[PDB]
Amino acid sequence: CRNVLLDPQLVPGGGASEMAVAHALTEKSKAMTGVEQWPYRAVAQALEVIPRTLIQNCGASTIR
Amino acid sequence: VKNAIDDGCVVPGAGAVEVAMAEALIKHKPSVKGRAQLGVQAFADALLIIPKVLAQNSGFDLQE
């Protein structure tokens, strides 16, 4: 509550939360095209580990 | 391939027939002991190795 009362915004979770920014992040890395791009690559898929865990949670094939 | 011409009869590949006999086997139908009823069980299993490895070698599982 006081976290929702803290924050009156809320997000569709899981990979939705995860897969959203990496693109913009890669889109950055692609655009930023520095060696900072490399973290934004290193940043990109780190979003997806709990999805992997979510894919663990369903018990399915993650790579797919 | 000559067998395809050498035999006007041919029979489906790619697993189509595989799960069928296994389904049709009805292992309990052999009731005599389990001389047959058990040996038919590894049989429907041995049948499906053809889809297995193919379902195997790709993503997912074989079974999946």
Side-chain angles (χ1 to χ4, degrees):
Chain A
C1 298
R2 58 171 297 280
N3 300 136
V4 175
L5 299 169
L6 168 64
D7 187 346
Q9 287 195 345
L10 39 78
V11 59
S17 294
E18 310 310 318
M19 189 69 75
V21 192
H23 293 71
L25 292 166
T26 57
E27 182 177 0
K28 288 165 60 182
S29 71
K30 292 186 291 291
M32 294 180 70
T33 188
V35 290
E36 292 178 348
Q37 55 168 14
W38 293 108
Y40 308 132
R41 296 182 182 82
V43 177
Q45 299 177 341
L47 296 165
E48 304 308 315
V49 52
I50 290 88
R52 300 179 175 84
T53 292
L54 293 168
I55 298 146
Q56 296 176 337
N57 296 343
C58 57
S61 66
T62 295
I63 51 195
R64 184 65 62 184
Chain B
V1 178
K2 181 71 182 298
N3 300 127
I5 186 163
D6 180 67
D7 294 343
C9 297
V10 184
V11 47
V17 307
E18 298 299 321
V19 295
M21 169 62 188
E23 295 171 353
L25 175 60
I26 184 51
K27 304 173 181 72
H28 189 278
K29 170 186 71 185
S31 297
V32 55
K33 179 179 179 180
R35 296 186 177 181
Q37 186 170 355
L38 293 167
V40 300
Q41 298 173 341
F43 170 82
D45 300 345
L47 295 174
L48 298 173
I49 190 59
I50 293 167
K52 291 185 178 76
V53 61
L54 291 174
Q56 177 186 357
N57 295 339
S58 296
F60 299 166
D61 296 344
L62 57 85
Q63 53 181 16
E64 181 175 359

